[PDB]
Amino acid sequence: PGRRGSFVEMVDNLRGKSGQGYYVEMTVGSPPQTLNILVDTGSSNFAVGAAPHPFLHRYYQRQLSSTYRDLRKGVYVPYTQGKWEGELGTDLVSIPHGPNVTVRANIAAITESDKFFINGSNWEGILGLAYAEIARPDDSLEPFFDSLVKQTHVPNLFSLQLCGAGFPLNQSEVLASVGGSMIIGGIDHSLYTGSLWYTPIRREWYYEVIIVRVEINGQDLKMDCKEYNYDKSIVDSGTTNLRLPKKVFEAAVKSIKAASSTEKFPDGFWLGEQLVCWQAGTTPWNIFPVISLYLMGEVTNQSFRITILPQQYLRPVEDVATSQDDCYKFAISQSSTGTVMGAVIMEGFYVVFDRARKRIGFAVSACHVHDEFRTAAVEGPFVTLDMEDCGYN
Numbered sequence: 400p401g402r403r404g405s406f407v408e409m410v411d412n413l414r415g416k417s418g419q420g421y422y423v424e425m426t427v428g429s430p431p432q433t434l435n436i437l438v439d440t441g442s443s444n445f446a447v448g449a450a451p452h453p454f455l456h457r458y459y460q461r462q463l464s465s466t467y468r469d470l471r472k473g474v475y476v477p478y479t480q481g482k483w484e485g486e487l488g489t490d491l492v493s494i495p496h497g498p499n500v501t502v503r504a505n506i507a508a509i510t511e512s513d514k515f516f517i518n519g520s521n522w523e524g525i526l527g528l529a530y531a532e533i534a535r536p537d538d539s540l541e542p543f544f545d546s547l548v549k550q551t552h553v554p555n556l557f558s559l560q561l562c563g564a565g566f567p568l569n570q571s572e573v574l575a576s577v578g579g580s581m582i583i584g585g586i587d588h589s590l591y592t593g594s595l596w597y598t599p600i601r602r603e604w605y606y607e608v609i610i611v612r613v614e615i616n617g618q619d620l621k622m623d624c625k626e627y628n629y630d631k632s633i634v635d636s637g638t639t640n641l642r643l644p645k646k647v648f649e650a651a652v653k654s655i656k657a658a659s660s661t662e663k664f665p666d667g668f669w670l671g672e673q674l675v676c677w678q679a680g681t682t683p684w685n686i687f688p689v690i691s692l693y694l695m696g697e698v699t700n701q702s703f704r705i706t707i708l709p710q711q712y713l714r715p716v717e718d719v720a721t722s723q724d725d726c727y728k729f730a731i732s733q734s735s736t737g738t739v740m741g742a743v744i745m746e747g748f749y750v751v752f753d754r755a756r757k758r759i760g761f762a763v764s765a766c767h768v769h770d771e772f773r774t775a776a777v778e779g780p781f782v783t784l785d786m787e788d789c790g791y792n
């Protein structure tokens with residue numbers, strides 16, 4: 400049967416890109432103050448710029464909102480890159496291209512920050528969509544999505560389609576382009592092809608999952624599966640790269656280098672620091688391998704796999720001389736805090752955060768970048784034993 404899209408109001412409500420973030424328009428306060436907010440499934444605080452900053456064109460003005468409530472408490476939030484400090488409060492919030500509801504939510508008014516805001520990113524705040532366990536200052540600060548579900552009839556689920564262009568976008572092109580969809584309270588069947596396969600959410604803090612096998616061009620990386628989830632594996636729209644635990648990163652890059660060995664790349668490229676360029680239209684996608692991550696299934700002893708292409712893990716960037724060449728950075732990097740399935744991997748898939756059923760669904764995205772010979776894939780089932788042992792304690 401033909402797939403129908405039943406959430407037209409929310410389709411195409413995101414803008415942005417993997418390197419700077421995907422954001423949604425929101426309003427806060429009375430009268431409403433419009434702000435662009437980065438969608439982050441890897442944190443749990445809703446926070447907005449609330450004081451002048453060289454990189455902000457607008458910010459939340461609490462003194463102009465008649466519905467503002469002061470919680471008289473400070474908050475500090477550190478991330479992998481950047482940190483900020485602010486003042487807690489509550490106010491009415493709406494999502495113009497979202498459900499037609501207004502809710503009262505906790506808002507951290509950012510007063511000081513370091514390496515958080517990004518010049519020309521067009522966003523002024525962050526929407527932490529994960530669970531209260533990781534909220535700052537503590538788990539008593541109800542996150543936005545928990546408030547939304549508690550105060551309305553919106554189902555306890557959201558889904559994300561992050562759309563990478565496959566080429567660089569400047570600030571003006573980002574403003575004029577659709578970056579994807581955040582469907583609040585449902586699944587839009589126009590956003591994916593094939594079937595949705597679900598992995599259990601291991602624990603409700605981050606969106607934690609369990610990886611049970613890793614392949615590079617079908618070749619098993621052959622590590623003990625606990626290594627892939629050391630000390631956790633999470634799905635994170637607020638991180639650019641696919642981040643892997645140090646030992647896994649070292650094995651994966653050795654395997655990716657071996658598969659792409661018909662061309663030699665500098666160490667700076669593999670460390671994700673240096674771009675590489677090819678003459679216009681000549682990027683040799685076929686020399687780079689596909690990467691498959693097998694995820695624990697919902698059925699006992701069953702797994703499924705998601706497969707990404709180099710069009711996902713090679714992030715388009717502009718040249719140092721803005722030439723006609725096609726340039727990229729390697730968007731796989733090391734981590735000391737476990738695996739992070741970041742925006743570059745999410746760009747291949749439609750991802751369903753089914754909080755109600757404690758599971759995350761993946762399907763091939765209708766907007767993923769590919770070539771005439773290969774596409775991203777979500778396939779299953781595979782018989783996989785002792786998958787619970789892949790989880791790190």
Ligand SMILES: CC[C@H](C)Nc1cc(C(=O)N[C@@H](Cc2ccccc2)[C@H](O)[C@H]2CCCN2)cc(S(C)(=O)=O)n1
Nearest residue numbers: 417418419420441442478479480481515637638639640
């Ligand atoms: C998608 C666009 C953002 C700007 N790119 C990022 C953000 C972070 C980060 O700390 N994300 C934060 C959120 C954030 C967004 C924008 C700016 C700063 C931080 C997120 O909450 C993480 C922290 C730990 C678990 N989830 C890390 C990386 S990395 C390591 O790939 O270089 N890339």
